[PDB]
C-alpha cells in the first residue's frame, strides 16, 4: 500500500545510495584528531543512546545525530572538554529535523549537567549547521533497514528489533564501522538478525534490490558478528539495556549464533 510507496521505493532507495556516499564521514578522522579517541566517541554515542531513551526520541534521531557528529569531526578538530557540546548540538539538530516534538534547548542544557550554557549549545548549533552546510537529510542504517524489512516472508518482529539493535551497536565503535556505508551495515545486520532468529539468509529479492550478496557483505558481517558476541563485555552497555525492553521484544537477551557458516 501507499505507506510503503510502491511507485517511489526504488527511486528512493537509489537516491539514498547516492546520498550515503556524499554524507559519508572520513574513515580515518580519529588519528587526525589530537585530543579525542574512538573510546571517547563510544562514551558519547552511548550517552546519546541514554538521552534518546530518557526523552523517548526516535531511533532515527539518534542515527542522524551520530551522522552529524562523525561528519563534523571529519573536518573540525575538537578538545575532549567540548566533545559533548558537539554531541548535544548534533542531537538538538537531529531532534528538530526528525521529531514531531523535539525537546527544548533548555532540556539539552539540562542533560549536560550544566557543563555548557544555553549560549554555548546555540552557538554550536550554528557551527554544526555551517560545517555541514545544512545537509541534514542524511541516509541512516534505519532508512535502509525498514526497506529491507519489507522483504521478510513472513514479517518477524524479533528479526526487525534484533536488526535495529545490531545496527545501533555499530554506531558505538568507529573502528571498524566508519569504513562501512549505512546500506551495508543494515544489510549485515538484517542477515545476522534473520539467521539468528529463523536460521534463514539474506534473500534473493534483496540481492535484486541492493546488488549486495553474502560475498560482498562478508567483511562487515564478520565484524558485526564479533561485535554481537562481545557485546555483553563492551564497556558501553546502554544499547543492550535499551533493547531488554519489551518495546523491542527483549532482543538483547537472544543468544548470538556461535558461527555463521558463511
Amino acid at each position: 500500500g501507499v505507506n510503503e510507496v510502491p511507485d517511489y521505493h526504488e527511486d528512493i532507495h537509489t537516491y539514498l545510495r547516492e546520498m550515503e556516499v556524499k554524507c559519508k564521514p572520513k574513515v580515518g578522522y580519529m588519528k587526525k584528531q589530537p585530543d579525542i579517541t574512538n573510546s571517547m566517541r563510544a562514551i558519547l554515542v552511548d550517552w546519546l543512546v541514554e538521552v534518546g531513551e530518557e526523552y523517548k526520541l526516535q531511533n532515527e534521531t539518534l542515527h542522524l545525530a551520530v551522522n552529524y557528529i562523525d561528519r563534523f569531526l571529519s573536518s573540525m578538530s575538537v578538545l575532549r572538554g567540548k566533545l559533548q557540546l558537539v554531541g548535544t548540538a548534533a542531537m538538538l539538530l537531529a531532534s528538530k529535523f526528525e521529531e514531531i516534538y523535539p525537546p527544548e534547548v533548555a532540556e539539552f542544557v539540562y542533560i549536560t549537567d550544566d557543563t555548557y550554557t544555553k549560549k554555548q549549545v546555540l552557538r554550536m548549533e550554528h557551527l554544526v549547521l555551517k560545517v555541514l552546510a545544512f545537509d541534514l537529510a542524511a541516509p541512516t542504517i534505519n532508512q535502509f533497514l525498514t526497506q529491507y524489512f519489507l522483504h521478510q516472508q513472513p514479517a518477524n518482529c524479533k528479526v526487525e528489533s534484533l536488526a535495529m539493535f545490531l545496527g545501533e551497536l555499530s554506531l558505538i565503535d568507529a573502528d571498524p564501522y566508519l569504513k562501512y556505508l549505512p546500506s551495508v551495515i543494515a544489510a549485515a545486520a538484517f542477515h545476522l538478525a534473520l539467521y539468528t532468529v529463523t536460521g534463514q539468509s539474506w534473500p534473493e529479492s534483496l540481492v535484486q534490490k541492493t546488488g549486495y550478496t553474502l560475498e560482498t557483505l562478508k567483511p562487515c558481517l564478520l565484524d558485526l558478528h564479533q561485535t554481537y558476541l562481545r557485546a555483553p563485555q563492551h564497556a558501553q552497555q546502554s544499547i543492550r539495556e535499551k533493547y531488554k525492553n519489551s518495546k523491542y521484544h527483549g532482543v538483547s537477551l537472544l543468544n548470538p549464533p556461535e558461527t555463521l557458516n558463511v
Partner: protein, 301 residues
C-alpha cells in the same frame, strides 16, 4: 553559498510568513532578481527554527524546474537569509485576476502537468510537501509553475512512520488526516493537487470547510460517505464515527460540470478515498488528460 547581503538591493516587500517577511531584491553584480526570505534568530529563543532546518536541508537536494530554487543561504549570527529565484505571482492571485474569463484549459493542463512533475520529484526524493495550496504555487512570465514553501515539508522513510497530525491547510487536507489515521503518505499531496485541479477550473475552493468535521462533511456530500467497500479500514479509523451521516456519492459530472471526460477521470483518481488506490504523481503524468499538453505563457500580466 557565495553570497553576502551587500550585493543585494531590496526592491519591495512581496509577502510574509510566520517565518517573517519576503523581499524582492536584485543582485547588483549579476543582475539577477531574487526573493529574500528573512528568518530572525536574535528574536529566536530555541535557536534555528525546525521549520527553517527542514526547508533549507530539503530544498538543497531538490533541483527541479517545478520546484522553487534556493540559490543561497546567508547565515549571520544575527540573521538567516534564504535566497530564492524570483517568481512574479502565486496561483491564488492569478485565479482572482482570471475572474470573469477563467483560466484557459491549455493553461490549467500545463499547470497541472508541471505540478505533478514537481511533486513526483519530491516523492522520488523521500519528501512530502504537506501544504500544497494555490498560495504556495508560484508562476513566472514564461509559463512555469513551481512548488514553494517547504517549511511544512518532511523527509519520510519507507514505510512511513507516524508524523505530525493536522498538517495541510484545511481546505486541501486529505480524508485520512481528518480521520486521525496513524499513518499518511505521498497520497496526501495528491489529494491537495486534486483540490487545486478542481479550483483552477471553477476558481473557487472545492471543499471550503470551517472546521475539521465540516471539512469532512463537505467532502462526504460530494464524494459520498465512504464505507468499507470504497475504503477498507475507514470505519475503524480513530476519528471515524458510525453516526456520520451517509451521503450518496454524486456523479463527478456535477462536481466540476465544465470538465471533459478525461479531466473527470483524472480528478476522480486524485480524490479517491482509499490512499492506496489514489493515483500517484508519477502515474498521473501518463493520464490521457495530458495528451495535447503545451507550456503556454500566462495570459495576464
Amino acid at each position: 553559498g557565495p553570497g553576502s547581503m551587500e550585493n543585494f538591493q531590496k526592491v519591495e516587500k512581496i509577502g510574509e510568513g510566520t517565518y517573517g517577511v519576503v523581499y524582492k531584491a536584485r543582485n547588483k553584480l549579476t543582475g539577477e532578481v531574487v526573493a529574500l526570505k528573512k528568518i530572525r534568530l536574535d528574536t529566536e529563543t530555541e535557536g534555528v527554527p525546525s521549520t527553517a532546518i527542514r526547508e533549507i536541508s530539503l530544498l538543497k537536494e531538490l533541483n527541479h524546474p517545478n520546484i522553487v530554487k534556493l540559490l543561497d543561504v546567508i547565515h549571520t549570527e544575527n540573521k538567516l537569509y534564504l535566497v530564492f529565484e524570483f517568481l512574479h505571482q502565486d496561483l491564488k492571485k492569478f485565479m482572482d485576476a482570471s475572474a470573469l474569463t477563467g483560466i484557459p484549459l491549455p493553461l490549467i493542463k500545463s499547470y497541472l502537468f508541471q505540478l505533478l512533475q514537481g511533486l513526483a520529484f519530491c516523492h522520488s526524493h523521500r519528501v512530502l510537501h504537506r501544504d500544497l495550496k494555490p498560495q504556495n504555487l508560484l508562476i513566472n512570465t514564461e509559463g512555469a509553475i513551481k512548488l514553494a514553501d517547504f517549511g511544512l515539508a518532511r523527509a519520510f522513510g519507507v514505510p512511513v512512520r507516524t508524523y505530525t497530525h493536522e498538517v495541510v491547510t484545511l481546505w486541501y487536507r486529505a480524508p485520512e488526516i481528518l480521520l486521525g489515521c496513524k499513518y499518511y503518505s505521498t497520497a496526501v499531496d495528491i489529494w491537495s493537487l486534486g483540490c487545486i485541479f478542481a479550483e483552477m477550473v471553477t476558481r473557487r475552493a472545492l471543499f471550503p470547510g470551517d472546521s475539521e468535521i465540516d471539512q469532512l462533511f463537505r467532502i462526504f456530500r460530494t464524494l459520498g460517505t465512504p464505507d468499507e467497500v470504497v475504503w477498507p479500514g475507514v470505519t475503524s479509523m480513530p476519528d471515524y464515527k458510525p453516526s456520520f451521516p451517509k451521503w450518496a456519492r454524486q456523479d463527478f459530472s456535477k462536481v466540476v460540470p465544465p470538465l471533459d471526460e478525461d479531466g473527470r477521470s483524472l480528478l476522480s483518481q486524485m480524490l479517491h478515498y482509499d490512499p492506496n488506490k489514489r493515483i500517484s504523481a508519477k502515474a498521473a503524468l501518463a493520464h490521457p488528460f495530458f495528451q495535447d499538453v503545451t507550456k503556454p505563457v500566462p495570459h495576464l500580466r
